[PDB]
Specification:
Largest sheet of chain A: 5 strands, antiparallel
GO molecular function, one term (chain C): flavin adenine dinucleotide binding
Catalytic activity (chain C): dUMP + (6R)-5,10-methylene-5,6,7,8-tetrahydrofolate + NADPH + H(+) = dTMP + (6S)-5,6,7,8-tetrahydrofolate + NADP(+); dUMP + formaldehyde + NADPH + H(+) = dTMP + NADP(+) + H2O
CATH architecture of chain A: 2-Layer Sandwich
Strand content of chain A: 15-25%
Radius of gyration of chain A: 20 Å
Largest interface: B-C, 46 and 48 residues
Pfam families (chain C): Thy1
Distance between the termini of chain A: 25 Å
Oligomer: homotetramer
Subunit structure (chain C): Homotetramer.
Structural class of chain A: alpha+beta
Number of helices of chain A: 8
Family (chain C): Belongs to the thymidylate synthase ThyX family.
CATH class of chain A: Alpha Beta
Order of helices and strands of chain A: EEHHEHEHHEHHH
CATH topology of chain A: Gyrase A, domain 2
Chain lengths: ~210, ~210, ~220, ~210
């Protein structure tokens, strides 16, 4: 359903649903359905002065597929609703280019290979424990942090902008940056005025 | 959808995201079995999937009802500004029947007139103050708690159900019970499966188990 | 610590968990004191504040007991990331006091009547509403119903438990000339107590994060 | 007050604000009191009984927890609280892993002796960790190298939570339906809670506790 952006080798960010648009913030700000452009001007005004409450009335629901180490960083954003999966087994294997700029003792290709290898061994050990009757909740603890998980994320535009301020930044890990770029992309698509105003006055990051 | 409450109040649905299937989709992270799922989640206390259904209501209510309402913190509220917003200057005047049930020294319709009288005296003093040059943020402090205010309320289904458990109940003041009934009505029309499961498995209040819709 | 506000209000500190060091321990995720270093610890507080790392300050918590007019309480309660427990108008026995603006309050606005008259006019209507209320009560009318005729300047009381992070957001918005003068007075008192208990955080706050105007002008 | 959990974990109390009376004062919205336990604890039961839990939001705890990441992930799903997890950016990083005891597999008829499963887990852990160190040695930054480490790697965090949110936590984790590992951490949390707020804790078990192991 709807927009879908592939991230990393097997990940993605999919837009499930969206409630409202830029006008939803305007209506809430004026507190009126009948008496809900001077409107785009209002959006900028609210953003400039930090009147963020109206933006809480725009809501998004995303379906995200990401490695657990990315999900854990993501989940630290408490002002939102999450529902994580609880079953296929895939892992994020960094591409050689990911090691861009680092003078590694061994070739990038080899680093990618070493990572694929322990992932392989951990996974085969997991399947073995399972086959012997070991409980899934127990056997799964040997699986690596690059294992892909999936979750639904329902978040309002205000909370989404705080999310972007922290993750859509060069100081954030590249992997999470990629997901934040995808989220920003969808946000931009569905709320042009809010997103533009956000970049103009409130965006604290540097990659957008 | 706009349901009139009390003498001048109302509850109006502004927008809504998703429906019963949004919770099923969230639960699975992906016919009659979907209904079975909704029922299962409700029966075992798995409330998180219902956070993926969201509503935005426009409510016009007396400030004393609004204040009680705002205690439900897991939601978003945007109310008119007492300092700068234009108001309708309307006030909730209880009907004689509202009193009936309590032994009073004077007729219920008398209690109604006295309330309407003091409200009239307060309002008059307010305008007198405004015309005199007194700023609204100060002049409005003399207006009574039964003055009507308006606000936008964006809330997810899980939180909405928690609100109904507490407000759609005999222990809550009659005025807010009336609003909770309107909220429940709209909730039912938009999420019939979640609503029925809610009544059958999680509703802690009492009035919705007897009051239709 | 109890500070009077307005004519019959106040802000009173009930309790507090932690101090500046609580944010430092949380930032380092360490319950080790055998390495205390004021210099380094105070530097970390500035660093966190300067770079917007707010989560550590969530581990410092305050509980205040506030007495304020309902119109002030309404504005205050819009700060949702905190816990509030207010007196019950339906049951709790109120003391029935009201905020009567001082003539100086209006002093500064062109009025068609002496500031003194406004004060008298407000005091008069309050008295009338209050009497009606009692008159309704003496008739057997439930207070949850009779209290609706009471004006918005009626005083209420509530306990407020908030962490330092949320407290700073509150000050950013309320300890500012844009906020109503009345709530500004309460915010200054909250800031005074906050400064007393977490001097390092308060200073770093004023230096790197405070968005308002008045706290950099008015002492403590 | 510290309680060891699992093989290398623990739960320790860093701080606490208030006690049973903090909820009482909040409920009554009054700082003073003067002299009455019988009345105080009756109010506490009254509140718990009728579901009036806002007063309990005025009792706060700060815990320091050491737990395997898979347990932490479940724990962090409780949003009404404040968390700060260990970071090499402010503190030194440690590398330990949760190795299940053979007993953990009791009740399960596994074709592999429980004590051998324990062995296989340690085996994979040791190899993943060695690969990790090797990647570090080659010049791979930690943020990338650590992705090969297992979910049983131990982490640490500070957790500040009020009594109300704490009771909800127990209702979901201090129960036979929660994974065993988290049940053990929840038990420790319940123990510290009982110690600092005996009245609230007693009332909780009597009228509201939804779990079964407590």
């Amino acid at each position: 359903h709807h927009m879908k952006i592939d991230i990393l080798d097997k990940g993605f960010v999919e837009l499930v649903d969206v409630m409202g648009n830029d006008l939803s913030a305007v209506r809430a700000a004026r507190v009126s359905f009948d008496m809900g452009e001077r409107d785009r001007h209002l959006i900028e005004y609210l953003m400039k002065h930090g009147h963020e409450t109206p933006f809480e009335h725009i809501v998004f629901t995303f379906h995200v597929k990401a490695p657990i180490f990315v999900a854990r960083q993501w989940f630290r954003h408490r002002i939102a609703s999450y529902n994580e999966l609880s079953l296929s087994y895939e892992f994020y294997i960094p591409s050689p280019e990911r090691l861009e700029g680092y003078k590694t003792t061994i070739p990038p290709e080899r680093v990618t290979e070493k990572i694929s290898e322990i992932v392989d061994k951990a996974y085969r050990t997991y399947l073995e424990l399972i086959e012997s009757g070991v409980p899934r909740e127990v056997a799964r603890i040997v699986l690596p942090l690059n294992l892909y998980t999936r979750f639904f994320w329902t978040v309002n535009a205000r909370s989404l902008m705080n999310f972007l301020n922290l993750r859509a930044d060069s100081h954030a890990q590249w992997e999470i940056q990629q997901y934040a770029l995808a989220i920003a992309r969808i946000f931009k698509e569905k709320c042009p005025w809010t997103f533009e105003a956000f970049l103009k006055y409130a965006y604290k990051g540097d990659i957008l």
